[PDB]
Amino acid sequence: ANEVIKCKAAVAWEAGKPLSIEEIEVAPPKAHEVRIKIIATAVCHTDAYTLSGADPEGCFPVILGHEGAGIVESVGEGVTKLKAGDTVIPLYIPQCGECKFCLNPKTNLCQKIRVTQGKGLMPDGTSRFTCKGKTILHYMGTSTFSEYTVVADISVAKIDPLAPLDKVCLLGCGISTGYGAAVNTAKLEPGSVCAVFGLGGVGLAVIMGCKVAGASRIIGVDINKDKFARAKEFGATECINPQDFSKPIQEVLIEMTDGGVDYSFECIGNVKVMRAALEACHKGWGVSVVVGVAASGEEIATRPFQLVTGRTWKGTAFGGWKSVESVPKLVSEYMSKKIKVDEFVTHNLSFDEINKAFELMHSGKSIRTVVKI
Amino acid sequence: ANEVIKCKAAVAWEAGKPLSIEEIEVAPPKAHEVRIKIIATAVCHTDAYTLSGADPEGCFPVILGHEGAGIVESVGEGVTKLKAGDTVIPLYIPQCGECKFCLNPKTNLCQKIRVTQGKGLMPDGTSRFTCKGKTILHYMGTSTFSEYTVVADISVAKIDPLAPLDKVCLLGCGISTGYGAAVNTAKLEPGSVCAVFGLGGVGLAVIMGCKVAGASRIIGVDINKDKFARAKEFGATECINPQDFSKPIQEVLIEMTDGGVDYSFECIGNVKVMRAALEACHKGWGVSVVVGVAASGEEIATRPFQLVTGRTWKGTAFGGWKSVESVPKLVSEYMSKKIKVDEFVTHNLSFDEINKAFELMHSGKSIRTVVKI
Numbered sequence A, B: 001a002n003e004v005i006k007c008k009a010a011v012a013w014e015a016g017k018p019l020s021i022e023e024i025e026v027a028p029p030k031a032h033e034v035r036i037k038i039i040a041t042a043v044c045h046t047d048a049y050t051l052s053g054a055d056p057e058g059c060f061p062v063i064l065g066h067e068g069a070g071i072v073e074s075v076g077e078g079v080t081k082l083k084a085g086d087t088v089i090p091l092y093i094p095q096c097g098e099c100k101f102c103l104n105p106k107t108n109l110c111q112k113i114r115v116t117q118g119k120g121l122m123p124d125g126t127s128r129f130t131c132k133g134k135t136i137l138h139y140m141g142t143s144t145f146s147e148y149t150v151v152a153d154i155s156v157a158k159i160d161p162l163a164p165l166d167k168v169c170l171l172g173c174g175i176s177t178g179y180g181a182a183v184n185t186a187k188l189e190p191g192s193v194c195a196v197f198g199l200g201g202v203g204l205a206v207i208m209g210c211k212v213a214g215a216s217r218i219i220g221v222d223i224n225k226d227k228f229a230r231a232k233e234f235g236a237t238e239c240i241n242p243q244d245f246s247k248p249i250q251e252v253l254i255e256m257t258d259g260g261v262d263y264s265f266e267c268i269g270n271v272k273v274m275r276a277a278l279e280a281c282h283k284g285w286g287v288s289v290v291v292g293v294a295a296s297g298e299e300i301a302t303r304p305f306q307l308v309t310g311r312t313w314k315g316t317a318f319g320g321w322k323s324v325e326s327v328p329k330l331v332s333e334y335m336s337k338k339i340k341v342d343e344f345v346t347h348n349l350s351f352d353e354i355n356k357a358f359e360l361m362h363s364g365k366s367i368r369t370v371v372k373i
Ligand SMILES: O=C(O)CCCCCCCCCCCO
Pocket: A044, A045, A046, A047, A109, A110, A111, A114, A173, A293, A317, A318, B308, B309
């Protein structure tokens, strides 16, 4: 049958500390669970956020990581859609396909296993990870920073067997979220004028999506000019540095587009930028999409007049993609060269050097660092 | 040859004081202007809001009133589509039909004459009103509180000649705004679950709209239980008084609807309630609409999480109706008994008793008081 697996994993023993490569034990999959051999994983700002200890919802010890790609090692009882050998991507936003949310076309926020996932546990209320006699928690239902992870069977996307995993693992969060924010949440029309705040991975995917949608103008906004070049390569028609102006960035964009942009996207998680992103939208029909995850407690604000006169404030989680359905298609779009993925990889590292991925993120030198398990 | 007209008008010489019935002069229509004989007018909370002085940009002396219906008395140079005798409704939201706003299907906010109108002046930068050697300012481009008023030729809706003016004057604002908020802004689908905050004329019109759109549950919310009976009559499936509960109203609504409403409308102009209305919306697809009625002066707020997890914050002005082409149709819908108007009229007064219309409103014992000129 399926035996316990002894492998390595990057364990987060405590908030504020770097990850530790430990020898852990991964229990076999129980009913409706699948054990996956992680081949490649990357670091998202959210992983770092939780690791810092700033996340009031974060618990330790825990195995982080939610951008990964691997191969099904084994499945539990009741699982028939997935089998050993299947090429897959773990999903932090599952798709049971039977709940109120999955059944509603307007959302992708499946709630079937949210409760247990938030507690870093499998649906049955227990963890599949142990290390040196201690229970180690799951993270975002994925825990991709391990040679082997166990996820709910509704948290799995079966993808093209030929997809390069050291690439598509990025579709686990960043690229998909940004891309979807443009084509799913905003659904911008050809010819639209867009503004993108934050030119990191997510921001670049937004630009990518805006270009796929046929936007006439895509204005990149970032205080770090070093990110401009790549933003342009992705489709940005122009980039502006807020520090180069002496007035509110909103005013700069308004004057720059004769009224404001048709669509703006905040990809940083900064509440002040979110407000500016909203107010930079054109009167009457402007739409602003919050893609970034702001620190707990922080709240956004603006004057109701902004909404009364036509602006709309929206947000998105994982680009609004119903995970199980979409991810395989997104991988196919990458395979057929409809969207870019490779362009997001700025660095490559081995599992033992996973901490450098975190460092490269803070230094803001990279977009995405792919970790080879 | 149009001459100066000596007539009666309700002038607001200053804020915080009752309107003064004065004898004024109304200059003839200059190029592209229309002089209308007001037959009936009503008082909207906005009129009282300006009068109270609580409005930052409120200027005096001025002739208030923006809910009116009348007959074209004469037209200025260049006016070809309108003539003496035409049945009309003045519009505070114009429709030049050629600026970028009028040409865009996503908005009704024509900007052609915004600037001058905001200053209580006609497009040429001057006022047609005078009284006792003093120039009196126009209001919202309509100034219906006069036997005769002059408006830009793009601020005029030509309506069905058979329409009872002592009725359709309410379509100048309140009814149209609430109704449009439901069918244009929200565009709620049949079966939708709704919540309406503020059960005044606007709220009742929103309820009527929700009913026309085929909403399943329509929850009226107001701290004044006296407004419940009429709300039910308009279609509210039930009403709740926030004061009958300890927990925040959004928590109450969330509990009542197993997650929150699909659409919520704030019809009071209170930023705290606006936040409640937004958070009272269901996760994933909830949409809250701020119905333009004030200029609160303050700001609205919430946690980005609300938007990230699916809720959408919108706003509306005059229900998003492209005024010149819509008002006539709304009149036709009332004529065809598709929508209600008569049910909004709770009191009737003569022009001389116009101040009483303001009293009935502040005491919240009334929906709409139609003033017969
Ligand atoms: O289903 C739910 O209740 C909540 C779903 C959470 C989705 C919001 C995304 C927050 C940031 C994490 C992903 C980006 O790194």
